[PDB]
């Protein structure tokens, strides 16, 4: 298994911004984040295809989040703006074979331990 290293998250006031980052111990073609709110299904949020730099978002977060990566293709970054209570969840970094499937189902190869994100109004 690839080893993932997660940072960022925590608490923020509604309408604010947080950034998550995630480092992989080796190259993979695709990296993303899914989240899980209480009682809810896993929800694919954002995913990047490294060689193409193409990026995929769920309907819930498109226009507010931006996923990007480092030049060395070892790390992904998630910038979350205009945050709302709906975005309170544990956010888990993940690798996947398919970003569109990932954004729709959160089907993953391997997943990190997660970070808490809480948004207060």
């Amino acid at each position: 298994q690839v080893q993932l290293q997660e940072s960022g998250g925590g608490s923020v006031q509604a309408g604010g911004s947080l950034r998550l980052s995630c480092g992989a111990s080796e190259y993979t073609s695709r990296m993303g984040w899914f989240r899980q709110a209480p009682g809810a299904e896993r929800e694919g949020v954002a995913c990047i295809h490294r060689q193409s730099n193409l990026s995929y978002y769920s309907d819930s977060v498109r226009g507010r989040f931006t996923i990007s990566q480092d030049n060395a293709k070892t790390t992904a970054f998630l910038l979350m703006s205009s945050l709302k209570p709906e975005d309170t969840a544990i956010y888990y970094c993940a690798t996947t074979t398919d970003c569109a499937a990932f954004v729709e189902r959160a089907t993953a190869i391997t997943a990190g331990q997660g970070t808490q994100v809480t948004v207060s109004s």
Binding site: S29, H49, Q51, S52, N53, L54, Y56, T97, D98, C99, A100, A101, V103, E104, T107
Partner: protein, 266 residues
Amino acid sequence: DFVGQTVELGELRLRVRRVLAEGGFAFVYEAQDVGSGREYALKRLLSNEEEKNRAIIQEVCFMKKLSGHPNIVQFCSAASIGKEESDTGQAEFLLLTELCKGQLVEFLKKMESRGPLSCDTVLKIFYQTCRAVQHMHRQKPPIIHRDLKVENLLLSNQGTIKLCDFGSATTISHYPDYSNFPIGEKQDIWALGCILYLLCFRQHPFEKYSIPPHDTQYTVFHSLIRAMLQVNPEERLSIAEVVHQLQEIAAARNVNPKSPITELLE
């Protein structure tokens, strides 16, 4: 000498108006239901071999299954005659479907003399082609097309793309009604990549490839072409990945990509 005849096909009585297309295995004809006046495409496939029988019947089964999608020709009926009963001395398979307005290339030829294809029109052509392929890949098990090329695509009377050639398609038989393994879908995406390149640049990317360095018209597609022509099939995009990006491109250009491609109809 098949045109002129009126042919029974179930309770349909169809007059064979003319030849639309030919080739190796089959002929395609325009036909008209004598009673109702309704029009169809009728594909007649002739067979002297059991192996061809299997190929032909498999193509029809694929057409039955995939019918019902906006971008696949609508299956209407099919029928056969054993060799004992036909004026060929051969097995006869008849396939009846919706009649389309023409082959896509014919319309591309005519647009060719009005400038390069508008990026919007390339987007509509390709999105609709990709939606058809996604419909095959979504089946459980996935149906793999294996011979995607622009010549095989049609344009319907309503100006939308229709995939019609399922004679090379394959899948797994007797699939339990768990596996999430790639089984050939990625070859389909490669073929699609070549179509997108072709539609933009009016040539095939191979006879390594090269997107024209100073193209500022089809720039919006450049990264998707490269992504669909990854040598490595695991790195190559799935059809869901391709379609997702095609919708984002569409949104960016304020285009409805499912709409009739009426620029091809003038």
